[PDB]
């Protein structure tokens, strides 16, 4: 079983190693701070089932902040398209440093 002496004694000795956005020793954020704050406020007073079926949009926004999967997919598609059209030869590219 899981017990709750952590809450019972009033010593929150283990809740600070836990998430981001708990106060760092110098007040700096992580890379996805605000996404976490809105996601935690979305799924706080929630029985973890309408958390699964209701906070899905902001959770996907947070996941794609954390890993940046499909944004890299879009950038990689741009890179492959740029490679094949410079292989073609149309507009010897002025996207680098000059016209």
């Amino acid at each position: 079983p899981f017990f709750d002496v952590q809450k019972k004694l009033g010593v929150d000795l283990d809740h600070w190693m836990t998430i981001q956005s708990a106060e760092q020793p110098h007040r700096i954020p992580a890379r996805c701070h605000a996404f976490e704050k809105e996601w935690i406020e979305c799924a706080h007073g929630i029985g973890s089932i309408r958390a699964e079926k209701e906070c899905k949009i902001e959770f996907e926004d947070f996941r794609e902040c954390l890993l940046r999967q499909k944004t890299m997919k879009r950038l990689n598609a741009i890179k492959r398209q740029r490679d094949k059209l410079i292989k073609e030869g149309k507009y010897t590219p002025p996207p680098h440093h000059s016209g």
Partner: protein, 98 residues
């Protein structure tokens, strides 16, 4: 997806198969356990660095020191087995049959 994570997970499977299939010496098995430990260390450390997961950045060094003292216990057990026998093979252990 930060492409290097694929290679380090494949490296984890390398170290895990090296831990599971092992022919003669227990020391190679224990050293591949240490390699698996290093794999988890590196993988989690790159994740925490790129996350700027700066509050709980304790995971690499503390995972390291705990599984290092695990490897110390394994060294002592291998020394005890090699002390009460001649060698430390996987064989000469077929006593106490299941």
């Amino acid at each position: 997806m930060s492409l290097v994570y694929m290679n380090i997970m494949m490296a984890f499977t390398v170290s895990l198969t090296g831990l599971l299939m092992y022919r003669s010496h227990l020391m190679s098995s224990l050293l591949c356990l240490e390699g698996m430990m290093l794999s988890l260390f590196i993988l989690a450390t790159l994740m925490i660095l790129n996350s700027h997961f700066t509050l709980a950045s304790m995971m690499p060094i503390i995972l390291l020191v705990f599984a290092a003292c695990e490897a110390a216990l394994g060294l002592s057990l291998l020394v005890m087995v090699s002390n009460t026998y001649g060698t430390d093979y996987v064989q000469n252990l077929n006593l106490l049959q299941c």
